[PDB]
């Protein structure tokens, strides 16, 4: 279990709106990395997923032996441990167990989540190129593995209702899931078949961020028309790219009890990878900007239960225009107009301030994370702290041109020293060992 | 505990003399590294120590927050786990426990060893520059920490007899120690005070490798004179640099039961860092070539017990002229003549063949390891397989100029697939994160 | 252990009713304070708790680094020792052990109690403003730490039955607890949820001090109606503010054996901080006047055991109209009429005379303590000796306007010199170091 | 025993000459004071003595019940404990034992020192005004008390040779003593009788600080004449005021084994209170400037043993002109000319830098401490860091006019966080409780 210095400083809004204005990054601190490195120049470690809870943390990433492509074989590294203070005062992520799922099943795009006594991971079995998954009417196999600290492992192939013949594909969002009221929630996304109830109920819906108007040159009618078309991809089997949540009751005999809950396309953009968070009793969702709007998308999720079962989710967006991401073509970090896009990178963000503490939801929100500071290339990894319209603190890592990819940010507080630390797990391109080196950068978020 | 595929292929001579001639390296294999990386550009991880036994493995290295110098503060990372096969057939070092000794005590030059149920580590507390330790008549504090898999930790300050007022300094050799007949043996080295019994008993002794004559231009009388002088250092407080073994009985209340057993300077060169091995029931010793002879030094150690206690050690050298190490001045990889030197690098070697299987000890010995292939710079790390006079297989890592330091090699066999794997733990200079990246390179030693 | 001069003069009624009339305060005596001071102008030491028993004494207070607010971080100082005579004849509290609980857990409102061989402390973990605790349906975490004189420390998170879903919050009363018949009893208070059994069983109950009639202008029917409403707070989450006792069996593995015993709201006023005392074999309770009646509230508690376990408590009030406390608005020291109030200060009192020694319980009771002599400000600390209707001896400390807060009084006798000494631990506002300086004032209670 | 974070950062020179130039004070940190407060307005706590060693610390001060005068009765408070880190990272002085010597013996001007397993304290019994001690030919009684952590106390009346009929008086210097090579050394001072060997051997000797010439307007011949006369006091019985060291072998049956070693008046100024320090293996001495030179006086002491017994001491002054002290008349902080003076205050200083690390002893020395920043009044306590000619960092405490007296400074390092902390024990005039409040101010000495 985590040290007493951290058990009460996890999953919360650490700063008040007033304090949020005086936050700055501190120097990076050196700690023994708990994320394994590749041992060959061509080895590939990618797609991390991290979850920190009151008692412990869970971590996982995918491993490919040669290069970063391979839809036949890959292994998945899983790790778990706790946080304890060092003599210097800052955190040390103590790994207490390790697992390497290597058995022939090609588990991909996995999302992990902390659960009482262990970790619950959700993956889908890949057997062909991503694009082919969208064209095939049958969805890939879905699995959820529960790994207890007592070394018991239980993997189950799940068949949640409303998936077969509705979704051509279904993928975990790779971002961490969360344990909520006895259920494990995971972010999901995929392609929905034309003519299905979901497709019809989603017909004509669209979402346009609150700050797009002042930045977009098109008129309201044109924006609306383009926005509506952005949820359909001809490149990905003519499916409706959908975002949602997978709710699974914590059980060791899961079969069809998990529930697929799609977001209304009136509150969310085109489906993409994502992450779920817990700030106090409120659930939040991060949605990768893989569509036309290149800015960080965070939403407060309201979950509705009907007979002890999650029955519907509602999302409220924290309106911002900060922290863009590299994109291709007319969907670069500079784009501001609705239309169909299918490019971007995963770069979640953590809310250092409560969006509900302001009379108007998210009128003044502060968040931290990393982002690739460029218009179209996955280059220049840069850790930052930002508000709705500006970056108020940032430090680029390495020299310009430094390649990088995904970034997962998580913050917690030392209730002893009373400081906030954030860990920025970034996929860095390495020249020595492996294609990428996933680094758990850690530094303090100083108030002043 | 280790998988059934490895429990019977540890600490042995894997190949016959005939097979030794047809061994070659295989490609490096990608596995999740079990050695932690630094998370800052200036962080420094150095001086590893690794031990693999029938049941499990122990690992440790030193960590310095800024740069690789600091005689005031450092932490020590300890890790332990087992070996299990992956779906690809090769090993995965599964970490089952991690520890970060961060508490203000500057434990340095630590040597770790596997013990029933845990790891036993031996370190000395550094509080001043190395050179000052040799001038001060008092030796540094010596500690041995036992860490059980059940998380119980017992650290003890030891005061073995014959140390105070005899050794100006005493250091573990950093190379792994070994559990032997109820005792944990660690390699040690340090400086002995002039006038002490040890000094007198060692007076006029010297050792000259069997193959030095044919390579050295000086005559026998000159060699002998210079060899004798090589055990005394004016730069290091005018002490007799001595090599030896520290024998500690496995107990949780150690105080003065450990025994300091110095090697006869008639069988060993000037004291240096070292490692102890176990091949079947025989103990072997690796001695860093920090003196005039730049070639790999391995010895078969004969330990004598008197009343259940180690009372004397004898060393028999495996005569070779292969695998030189970078040195400074007239002590470069090209030197072959006796004289006083105090330069080199740690680069142990593993014996793939039994030196006693030949009518004349070590007449035909094969070993594997890594070495910095250059005359004076710690550059060009190169893994190899060699015999007494030649390198018969080798592959350099990275491009020329690639900086590196120490190298610890360990081999074991998959009694299932029947192949031998060797892990080459090398300190690599990194340009991205940290000063060094200690990498556990792994590859097969193919017969054919 | 305490000196022979005190072991037989602890926890008793020291004077007869006749003697009680001729008691006066003596000059303050100078002794080395055993309560630590802050070392910065803004440091804050507050909320003390003291316990003196036949063998030794326990002391503790909360420490906040900057200012006296902070619901994220605080440390708790614990101290223990004995009493010995000085050459001048008066007591010296000899500290024999000190402890500083600094680890990130925000232990607040702690109550300490003497136990055989050590101290037992009861605290709750604060993670948000007090008011929020009343609104949240879940109660804060509750912990009891046992600290033995032999330096062994055992802390346990307790979950006594009848707390979850009944009490929105639960707090120790900060006043000392007592070791009674193998159990440690602590005063508690908090808010009870509407609709719970406790709430229903307490419905329509109220208590009105015996001397309120002659001082209150409202009629009996109006008083009754207002009194009933005084146990409910709309400001504190619409809960029923309840007073009670927490009974814990002396064990090192406490989990859910402690018992929450609430007082009947027919014998006690609205819940508030409190203290438990031991006079011979009788248990007494002090209840802070945080409601409409501003006078010192002391009760003789009758505890009922059912199968070796405390099953019910009954309280009998010692009727007085002396020693008022500063309050806000219509609840100042001058108020005498029932109604809802939520203001006051902690100011316990010690009984120098047995209330049961009179034909009518407490008809003539004498007590000593300190009180802030003003109507609404926490100002003018004043030590005194009083009876049911009048103050018969008093001495203010410092000049008028001197700020102060809580006051804990404890008396004991020198069976050698045969004099009674009382220690008045008062929180004094300081201008030099820290916000407050908790002072252990000591003086004699002279007979004559 | 002290925490591992401090055991290796005690009694040393913490910074290099280069670093010494970039040192600044940090904010004061709040920790529970381990120095007891008075409990009456007139109570008087004065004359502290503190000693920190590798294993633990010792503390003591004198207590007078009414006012700060009284040559008949006083008690002496003794305390001992260790240092441990808090959750905030800074030190907490954990008191593990307390003692109050109250028995009728008026022990004054005590100096305490750490010894293996306890504390050794040296005091003299006062029975008349200080001045009378100088006129009486007989010296006061001298006692040394040893207090073990195991509660055993052994007090002995000592009669070291060469005291009777040589010294009219003898006093410990109140500054801490030190345990050195099996002996406890204490600073001493007193008046020597005219005609004695000591007096004759000291005849015509004098010392003039190296930097006095450039600041003094008198010529060399006048300075010399006045300097010589400064060691004789007509006000103090016409004695030669002498400084020295008392060496006592650690024994429980001391009688006349302690040795009085006077400093040569050619290397030291007129005798005054003092303190002894240990920096590595070197002993240092601080001499109160109670004579004409108002600047901090520190000396490196060379002790000579003859047959295992201290036989002679030699002092080498660290030449400075910084940190003056308040004085009376023509001996104020502004004075620079030799002559007879008998005024000043105790204000030791700690060397943050090694005076021997420079080609010319003390050519560039840095020290920290506190000083009363005024010319003649004991007012304006001010903590500082200074070099030979200037104060390079300082912060006054409280508002101007704030009365204060003695100041004892001690620094140590957190070998974990690698920061240096210094404790400034200052006698502060208080308006609330007691005449003085001795405060253990603590703050960091930051490098940068
Ligand atoms: C490791 O912990 C898990 C979690 O408690 C144990 O799981 C139990 O498994 C049994 C059947 O094998 C179920 O009937 C229980 O309901 C499970 N417990 C629950 C509710 O989580 C698992 O058995 C543990 N490993 C062992 C056997 O030691
Ligand atoms: C985000 O932060 C920026 C920078 O801190 C804010 O911009 C400042 O706004 C204030 C007005 O409140 C101006 O006085 C400053 O001049 C602005 N900084 C500059 C020069 O750009 C911005 O208001 C914040 N956005 C919000 C409200 O969330
Ligand atoms: C973890 O394993 C060790 C090794 O067995 C246990 O050590 C025992 O400790 C006790 C005293 O605490 C000794 O008297 C025994 O001799 C030790 N066993 C031996 C011989 O190794 C240790 O107690 C274990 N941890 C726990 C308490 O579970
Ligand atoms: C070490 O290995 C080398 C290379 O395999 C051996 O050299 C060969 O020796 C054989 C004779 O037995 C010759 O026929 C080959 O021509 C040699 N190789 C060449 C061309 O260098 C060497 O003998 C081995 N050393 C020993 C005996 O340990
Ligand atoms: C509390 O003490 C007061 C003062 O000592 C008592 O008042 C005195 O009562 C007697 C009668 O027994 C009168 O003769 C005095 O004149 C009263 N003192 C004055 C002048 O106020 C009071 O009776 C005591 N209260 C009780 C009975 O507990
Ligand atoms: C407390 O510790 C001291 C220090 O060791 C003990 O002192 C010993 O006292 C005896 C006589 O009473 C001497 O003969 C020894 O030489 C002392 N030990 C030394 C060398 O320091 C003391 O006895 C201890 N208290 C007890 C009795 O437990
Ligand atoms: C003591 O410190 C002072 C201030 O840091 C030193 O004075 C500085 O000396 C340098 C030359 O080395 C000048 O460039 C600066 O201008 C000086 N500071 C000022 C403006 O006063 C002083 O030299 C130090 N004394 C020594 C040598 O110990
Ligand atoms: C943050 O810093 C600004 C500038 O110094 C200050 O004015 C403001 O009060 C601070 N905000 C808070 C409340 O921390
Ligand atoms: C190794 O290879 C050589 C060359 O093919 C072969 O002649 C020899 O028999 C082999 N050695 C053994 C016994 O493995
Ligand atoms: C207390 O003092 C009064 C007045 O002197 C005296 O009459 C009375 O007897 C005393 N009470 C007792 C019994 O101590
Ligand atoms: C101290 O600070 C100065 C000014 O930044 C810098 O130039 C100097 O190198 C520092 N000294 C050292 C070596 O710490
Ligand atoms: Ca499909
Ligand atoms: Ca030494
Ligand atoms: Ca609550
Ligand atoms: Ca005298």
mmCIF file of N, CA, C and O and ligand atoms in Angstrom, chain C residues 364 387-390 392, ligand 5:
data_model
loop_
_atom_site.group_PDB
_atom_site.id
_atom_site.type_symbol
_atom_site.label_atom_id
_atom_site.label_comp_id
_atom_site.label_asym_id
_atom_site.label_seq_id
_atom_site.Cartn_x
_atom_site.Cartn_y
_atom_site.Cartn_z
ATOM 1 N N UNK C 364 -23.982 21.776 46.476
ATOM 2 C CA UNK C 364 -22.868 22.653 46.826
ATOM 3 C C UNK C 364 -21.587 22.050 46.241
ATOM 4 O O UNK C 364 -20.929 21.225 46.883
ATOM 5 N N UNK C 387 -18.078 28.079 42.902
ATOM 6 C CA UNK C 387 -19.097 27.170 43.416
ATOM 7 C C UNK C 387 -20.265 27.342 42.467
ATOM 8 O O UNK C 387 -20.126 28.046 41.454
ATOM 9 N N UNK C 388 -21.405 26.719 42.780
ATOM 10 C CA UNK C 388 -22.576 26.764 41.891
ATOM 11 C C UNK C 388 -23.082 28.116 41.426
ATOM 12 O O UNK C 388 -23.598 28.241 40.314
ATOM 13 N N UNK C 389 -22.893 29.147 42.237
ATOM 14 C CA UNK C 389 -23.402 30.462 41.885
ATOM 15 C C UNK C 389 -22.370 31.567 41.843
ATOM 16 O O UNK C 389 -22.617 32.614 41.259
ATOM 17 N N UNK C 390 -21.212 31.355 42.444
ATOM 18 C CA UNK C 390 -20.216 32.411 42.448
ATOM 19 C C UNK C 390 -18.768 31.976 42.282
ATOM 20 O O UNK C 390 -18.399 30.836 42.579
ATOM 21 N N UNK C 392 -15.285 32.356 43.760
ATOM 22 C CA UNK C 392 -14.793 32.722 45.081
ATOM 23 C C UNK C 392 -13.295 33.000 45.153
ATOM 24 O O UNK C 392 -12.749 33.241 46.235
HETATM 25 C C1 LIG E 5 -20.900 30.367 46.853
HETATM 26 O O1 LIG E 5 -20.004 31.219 47.583
HETATM 27 C C2 LIG E 5 -20.613 32.478 47.952
HETATM 28 C C3 LIG E 5 -19.511 33.364 48.505
HETATM 29 O O2 LIG E 5 -18.678 32.638 49.395
HETATM 30 C C4 LIG E 5 -21.751 32.216 48.940
HETATM 31 O O3 LIG E 5 -22.376 33.455 49.356
HETATM 32 C C5 LIG E 5 -22.358 33.726 50.720
HETATM 33 O O4 LIG E 5 -23.451 33.032 51.341
HETATM 34 C C6 LIG E 5 -23.475 33.210 52.781
HETATM 35 C C7 LIG E 5 -24.619 32.356 53.312
HETATM 36 O O5 LIG E 5 -24.225 30.999 53.467
HETATM 37 C C8 LIG E 5 -23.657 34.695 53.126
HETATM 38 O O6 LIG E 5 -23.624 34.884 54.539
HETATM 39 C C9 LIG E 5 -22.571 35.541 52.455
HETATM 40 O O7 LIG E 5 -22.884 36.916 52.638
HETATM 41 C C10 LIG E 5 -22.517 35.219 50.949
HETATM 42 N N1 LIG E 5 -21.434 35.931 50.312
HETATM 43 C C11 LIG E 5 -21.722 37.008 49.594
HETATM 44 C C12 LIG E 5 -21.703 38.337 50.332
HETATM 45 O O8 LIG E 5 -22.024 36.967 48.401
HETATM 46 C C13 LIG E 5 -22.780 31.307 48.280
HETATM 47 O O9 LIG E 5 -23.760 30.969 49.244
HETATM 48 C C14 LIG E 5 -22.117 30.022 47.732
HETATM 49 N N2 LIG E 5 -23.088 29.269 46.960
HETATM 50 C C15 LIG E 5 -23.375 28.020 47.299
HETATM 51 C C16 LIG E 5 -24.352 27.798 48.437
HETATM 52 O O10 LIG E 5 -22.886 27.054 46.734
#
